[PDB]
Design a protein around this ligand. Structure first.
Ligand code: PT5
Ligand code: Y01
Ligand code: R16
Ligand code: R16
Ligand code: R16
Ligand code: R16
Ligand code: R16
Ligand code: R16
Ligand code: R16
Ligand code: R16
Ligand code: R16
Ligand code: R16
Ligand code: R16
Ligand code: R16
Ligand code: R16
Ligand code: R16
Ligand code: CA
Lengths: 411, 162, 146, 188, 49, 163
């Protein structure tokens, strides 16, 4: 199948070389048929031009499309809505801290003068001051970092003492994190605990950890790897850095356009399903060759769906193509079944890249604009407040500059 | 008077939970910051109508000692409501610069103050229309610390002037 | 010649490398004398490029010292020869435009360093989950019936 | 590529060729061009992991190589670091090329550019009426006037003042009066 | 080589036992989730940054 | 003539289109459940999953009938076949009808168009249509890169032929 015997065969093998799949095997074949002195001048220019230069062109065109589309009236309006919501949340958090300080002073003055209720409320206020402290932050980070170390040392043929040590340490850490979650919910309040999304993730992870402990008690063998997700709480190490704003705004933009991300991952799923069903029709049951039945077949739906997913990721799509050609009669009469794989690796390589680069660019540009705008507003408000207080007592990236220019053009 | 009488206004009508608590946090900051230098007194006499007149002269003899006086009034929700009076108190304005965050504050403050949401937001908007010059101090800050430091700096400047 | 360790071409190139090492260590002593060592700022060892040049020259000198043709150690001499590959990494401090390109690349790396940390943490989490799944299970026989 | 090819020669260059491994007559480290071909193969991801496994410690060394054991577990770092360093440098080159042409990639049909200038050059072949119909002291001040009509900096005397200011900002290299000569013709 | 790693992962019976083709096919979800995250999402996050 | 065209438009009330969505998902599940065997063999469950087809073709004919009588067909400049998605549904249901012709050459190819039924999820969920158009509007500029790729492929294919 991989020969230059014909213009159609040559087109097919050059296309398979473009995708950089089995392109060195073709080069090695021309290194055996002829000398190796000149074959690289055909394949390395081929890879560079049709694979690295064309990917560069696609990236540039796609990024320009994303830049133009970002600075449109409705997309800009949605971003301004998100920015306004973030500013409102900041102001509301500050004022809530104000009102809680008022709570504390009122409770103190009332205690100096329902006794059970007052004691309970003062204890609740002490806990809410404790869970918000910088010492609680670091003790929880140390507990988490010690927990990841415990699961990092799990290996094959670990000592029996280590297995039991980590078995009991998992219980210790689960109890400590349940205590930490209960303390945070009591101090902050269950409505305010679930206010930040990362506490929602922590609650979900602790629930999953309890469920995994129960299931391991029921069925010892099965491990879901859910207790490992507590390692994601090391992402708070970023709160003591000047990079919390960017990463937090990235997560804010992701959670904002989550109903557009999930509906993007479902159109990809539907296209994968459609191509899996089409491959089931074309090659379903026809991969039972002599001496071998490939695991990458289209016989069932799980098999077809995995085969289509693997062709989308691009790896070894050519071997599946050779099987799908040889299943319809070989080179003589089955070579028009390569259009399935050509279409699936063309309109799947670039729709994957389109969708995921669109998600990444939209959300990272939203995060950039959010953090830049909050810093700009902070500095402008600082200047205004300093000037008024004195009154009463007496670079940029190419992307950002082009985005500003497109904003002026659209207005 | 020798020392201008410190009075807070700006979140919403007095008596309501959010306004009372924000103003009480500011008052407690002033009290534990200016202890021995400021006076906190609760007043039930409508200064805007100037039993009413009995308290104003009491305010002078607090203010006639070269010491700052802070007023816990309960009937003034306007700067011009005290413009016709001879006392002329300092109007420190705690500006919530957006009705949305104030509405969220009201909703968060239990369920009792939510039933008076419309009138309280209307009063906040009423204070919003007032020109900024009618208020002596504008407190746009979101944090307690920033607003308290702004007010404390202004009070230090006033103390140095007087 | 990676394979013909005793070929005449390698014998000629070892004398050539003698010449290049002589030139490099001469320039080394010139820089030491002129700029001055780490005892003050604005001198040698204040730049990582200077440290790179020094380690290249020192490694070449150590390899020459070990070249007694006694066979006592073989891995050390080969690794010290491999240390020579930083030698073309000298033409990048010398060229201003190559240095500008390198600094742009390093700035891009610094720009993506925060998400690189997140990526590495997520991959560590998936590595730990994959160990909890497939630990001790990737064993097989050449006889698929056992 | 040069650095990694030299290191590949010096560490993995004496591994014995084996057609049943990934160090073959085709994919060895035995010369600069062979090592550099191997690195290009790995950059495009052509079973680079199998090459790295064939480059590990305790491989059969070459018949003519004086060493007894050839290959090393340095291959893990060699191949992993080459993979992400090469990917990162590809990405930096790609983004540098894209951001060089980011004006063209975000070009709008309504806004002008090199295409409008080329079209007015073709107008040379009166014809200005037809071009203005087809639109989006001989040919240079006319181009300045076309830019004035497209983008906007009395009103016209202020425009001339801004044009002279820009010309003073962008004074040519060793010209007597090049842009200033166009200014007297571009004033109207 | 990721299809071979996926094949070894699904055809994985138990600790210190040999493979069994078609066993534990639900463990393909680990590599599907992995691909959606690192090759697809995170790599494009780097490209965007 | 027009007596029911005034009434069948209310038949597009949300429970009806949600029932259509549910039957579409059921068709997708039935398609997923099928297993293909080499040389004419059929699993016992494939017989049931092949006998369940006429229900799906009937329900899709029912939606087509409602959408053509309540709406127009081509004429009124707003109609059934003038919507790009309804063309796909019309093709699917028409080939479903042709799949019950009792002939020879139909089955091998008219069973293949049965795989466009999952895209009836997109055709029935307008939010998925909006997201799909957002995807596809960023790939119209890439058609020119497609021309460049095809030109490069022809150039290197001709060189490979020569050599
Ligand atoms: C999308 C394409 C394909 C999908 C691939 C996804 C790939 C996954 C990668 C996507 C995101 C990864 C890139 C960014 C990484 C984040 C680094 C910085 C951490 C970060 O951003 O923070 C979280 C992230 O929450 C997560 O979901 C933590 C991340 C969990 C990720 C797993 C979620 C489950 C996955 C499926 C859903 C969002 O920010 P946050 O708003 O929750 O942070 C709060 C907030 O700042 C509060 O103000 C703060 O209180 P104070 O500052 O004291 O007033 C809270 O502190 P306390 O809890 O102590 O009270 C913080 O916890
Ligand atoms: C802050 C977070 C990311 C903690 C992660 C720390 C890692 C850098 C450390 C912690 C535990 C370490 C592991 C602890 C135990 C082992 C097993 C060890 O395997 C053997 O001992 C093999 C031979 C045998 O079977 O005895 C190899 C290193 C490794 C993975 C260590 C490698 C480095 C690890 C992952
Ligand atoms: C930086 C690009 C690297 C690719 C260049 C590799 C060239 C490989 C040629 C090998 C074939 C033998 C050469 C005979 C002359
Ligand atoms: C006797 C020669 C056998 C091998 C022939 C291959 C030579 C290939 C030369 C390169 C062709 C030009 C590539 C197009 C773009 C640079
Ligand atoms: C955007 C990516 C979505 C891809 C979802 C499907 C990928 C492959 C799933 C394989 C499911 C195997 C189930 C096995 C049951 C026995
Ligand atoms: C446009 C891509 C081409 C893909 C199909 C290639 C078809 C070539 C096969 C037909 C040529 C004659 C085959 C008989 C001799 C082996
Ligand atoms: C997305 C479009 C894919 C279309 C694939 C067309 C394949 C047609 C079947 C291949 C020819 C088989 C003929 C011999 C059958 C034994
Ligand atoms: C850190 C990885 C370096 C090497 C990258 C190899 C390829 C990465 C992308 C995978 C291609 C899948 C299709 C496109 C995904 C958006
Ligand atoms: C054959 C034996 C002689 C070879 C000498 C080296 C060839 C030229 C390389 C010079 C590099 C400076
Ligand atoms: C600021 C100067 C730093 C010193 C130069 C370091 C450059 C980066 C080198 C990375 C690759 C070196 C070879 C690694 C081979 C495994
Ligand atoms: C250090 C910077 C250059 C990289 C050289 C690699 C280390 C020496 C060779 C590997 C060790 C012997 C297998
Ligand atoms: C025959 C040698 C066996 C393996 C010895 C080397 C172990 C791995 C070395 C890894 C070095 C990584 C960093 C070097 C460059 C910074
Ligand atoms: C196979 C027996 C154990 C081999 C031990 C040597 C490990 C090699 C060093 C790996 C260095 C990290 C590679 C990835 C780059 C961060
Ligand atoms: C040197 C830091 C580690 C490498 C980080 C980025 C490596 C992968 C970037 C993407 C490479 C492929 C180009 C874009 C394909 C969509
Ligand atoms: C039957 C047990 C295995 C089920 C399939 C794999 C479960 C774990 C999938 C990956 C979980 C990580 C989610 C992403 C977190 C960053
Ligand atoms: C306007 C909407 C047009 C939708 C076209 C749907 C085509 C479905 C893919 C078939 C291959
Ligand atoms: Ca591959």
């Amino acid at each position: 199948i991989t020969n230059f015997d014909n213009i159609l065969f040559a087109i097919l093998t050059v296309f398979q070389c473009i995708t950089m799949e089995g392109w060195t095997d073709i080069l090695y074949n021309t290194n055996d048929a002829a000398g190796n002195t000149w074959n690289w001048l055909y394949f390395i220019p081929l890879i560079i031009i049709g694979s690295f230069f064309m990917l560069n062109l696609v990236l540039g065109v796609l990024s320009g499309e994303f830049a133009k589309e970002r600075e449109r009236v409705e997309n800009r309006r949605a971003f301004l809505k998100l920015r306004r919501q973030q500013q409102i949340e900041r102001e509301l958090n500050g004022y809530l801290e104000w009102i809680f300080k008022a709570e504390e002073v009122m409770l103190a003055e009332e205690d100096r003068n329902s006794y059970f209720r007052r004691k309970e409320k003062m204890f609740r206020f002490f806990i809410r001051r404790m869970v918000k402290a910088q010492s609680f932050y670091w003790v929880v980070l140390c507990v988490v970092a010690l927990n990841t170390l415990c699961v990092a040392m799990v290996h094959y043929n670990q000592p029996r003492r280590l297995t039991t040590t980590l078995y009991f340490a998992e219980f210790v850490f689960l109890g400590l994190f349940l205590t930490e979650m209960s303390l945070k919910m009591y101090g902050l309040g269950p409505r305010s605990y679930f206010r930040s999304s990362f506490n929602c993730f922590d609650f979900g992870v602790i629930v999953g950890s309890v469920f995994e402990v129960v299931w391991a008690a029921i069925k010892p063998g099965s491990s879901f790897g859910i207790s490992v997700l507590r390692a994601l709480r090391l992402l708070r190490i970023f709160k003591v850095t000047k990079y919390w704003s960017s990463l937090r705004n990235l997560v804010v933009s992701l959670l904002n356009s989550m109903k557009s991300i999930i509906s993007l991952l479902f159109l990809l799923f539907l296209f994968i399903v459609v191509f899996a069903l089409l491959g089931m029709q074309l090659f379903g049951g026809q991969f039972n060759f002599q001496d071998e039945t490939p695991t990458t077949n289209f016989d069932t739906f799980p098999a077809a769906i995995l085969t289509v997913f693997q062709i989308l990721t691009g790896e070894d799509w050519n071997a599946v193509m050779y099987h799908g050609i040889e299943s319809q009669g070989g080179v003589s009469k089955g070579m028009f079944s390569s259009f399935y794989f050509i279409v699936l690796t063309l309109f799947g390589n670039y729709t994957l890249l389109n969708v995921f680069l669109a998600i990444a660019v939209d959300n990272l540009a939203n995060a950039q604009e959010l953090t830049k705008d909050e810093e700009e507003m902070e500095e402008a408000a600082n200047q205004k407040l300093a000037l008024q207080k004195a009154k009463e007592v007496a670079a940029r990236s190419v992307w950002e500059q082009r985005a500003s220019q497109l904003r002026l053009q659209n207005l | 008077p020798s020392m201008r009488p410190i009075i807070l206004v700006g979140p919403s009508l007095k008596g309501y939970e959010v306004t009372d608590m924000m103003q009480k946090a500011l008052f407690d900051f002033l009290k534990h910051r200016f202890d021995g230098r400021i006076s906190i007194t609760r007043v039930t006499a409508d200064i805007s109508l100037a039993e009413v007149q009995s308290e104003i002269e009491r305010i002078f003899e607090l203010a006639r000692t070269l010491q700052l006086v802070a007023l816990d009034a309960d009937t003034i929700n306007h700067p011009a409501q005290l413009s016709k009076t001879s006392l002329a108190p300092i109007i420190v304005y705690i500006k919530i610069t957006s009705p949305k965050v104030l509405q969220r504050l009201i909703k968060s403050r239990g369920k009792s103050q939510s039933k008076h949401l419309n009138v309280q937001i209307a009063a906040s908007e009423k204070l919003a229309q007032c020109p900024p010059e009618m208020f002596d101090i504008i407190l746009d800050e979101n944090q307690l610390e920033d607003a308290c430091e702004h007010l404390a700096e202004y009070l230090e400047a006033y103390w140095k002037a007087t | 010649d990676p394979v013909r360790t005793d070929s005449p071409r390698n014998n000629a190139l070892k004398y050539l490398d003698y010449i290049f090492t002589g030139v490099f260590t001469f320039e080394m002593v010139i820089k030491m004398i002129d700029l001055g060592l780490l005892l003050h700022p604005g001198a040698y060892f204040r730049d990582l490029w200077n440290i790179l040049d020094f380690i290249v020259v020192s490694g070449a000198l150590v390899a020459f010292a070990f070249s007694g043709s006694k066979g006592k150690d073989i891995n050390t001499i080969k690794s010290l020869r491999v240390l020579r590959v930083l030698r073309p990494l000298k033409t990048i401090k010398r060229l201003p435009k190559l240095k500008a390109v390198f600094d742009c690349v390093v700035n891009s790396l610094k720009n993506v360093l925060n998400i690189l940390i997140v990526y590495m943490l997520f991959m560590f989490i998936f590595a730990v989950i994959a160990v909890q799944l497939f630990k001790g299970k990737f064993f097989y026989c050449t006889d698929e019936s056992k | 590529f040069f650095i990694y090819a030299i290191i590949g020669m010096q560490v993995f260059g004496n591994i014995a060729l084996d057609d049943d491994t990934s160090i073959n007559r085709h994919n060895n480290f035995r010369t600069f061009l062979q090592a550099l071909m191997l690195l290009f193969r790995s950059a495009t991801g052509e079973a680079w992991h199998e090459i790295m496994l064939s480059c590990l410690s305790n491989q059969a060394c070459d018949e003519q190589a004086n060493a007894t054991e050839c290959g090393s577990d340095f291959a893990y770092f060699y191949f992993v670091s080459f993979i992400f360093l090469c990917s990162f440098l590809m990405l930096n080159l790609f983004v540098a090329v894209i951001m060089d042409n980011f004006e063209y990639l975000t070009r709008d049909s309504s806004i002008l550019g090199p295409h409008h200038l080329d079209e007015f050059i073709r107008v040379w072949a009166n014809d200005m009426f037809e071009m203005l119909k087809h639109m989006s002291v001989h040919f240079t001040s006319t181009l300045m006037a076309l830019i004035r009509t497209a983008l906007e900096i009395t009103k016209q005397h202020q425009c001339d003042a801004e044009l002279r200011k820009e010309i003073s900002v962008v004074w040519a290299n060793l010209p007597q009066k090049t842009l200033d000569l166009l200014v007297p013709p571009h004033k109207p | 080589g990721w299809p071979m790693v996926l094949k070894h992962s699904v055809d994985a019976t138990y600790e210190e036992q040999g493979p069994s083709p078609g066993y534990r096919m639900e463990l393909s979800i680990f590599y599907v989730v992995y691909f959606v995250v690192f090759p697809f999402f995170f790599v494009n996050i780097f490209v965007a940054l | 003539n027009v007596v029911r065209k005034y009434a069948k438009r209310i038949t597009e009330w949300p429970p009806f289109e949600y029932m259509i969505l549910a039957t579409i998902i059921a068709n997708c599940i039935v398609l997923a459940l099928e297993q293909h065997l080499p040389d004419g063999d059929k699993t016992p469950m494939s017989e049931r999953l092949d006998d369940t087809e006429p229900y799906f073709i009937g329900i899709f004919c029912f939606e087509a009938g409602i959408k053509i009588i309540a709406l127009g067909f081509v004429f009124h400049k707003g109609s059934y076949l003038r919507n790009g998605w309804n063309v796909m549904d019309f093709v699917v249901v028409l080939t479903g009808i042709l799949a019950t012709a009792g002939t020879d050459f139909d089955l091998r190819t008219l069973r293949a168009v049965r795989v466009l039924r999952p895209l009836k999820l997109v055709s029935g969920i307008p939010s998925l249509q909006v997201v799909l158009k957002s995807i596809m509007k960023a790939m119209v500029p890439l058609l020119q890169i497609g021309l460049l790729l095809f030109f490069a492929i022809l150039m290197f294919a001709i060189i490979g032929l020569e050599f």
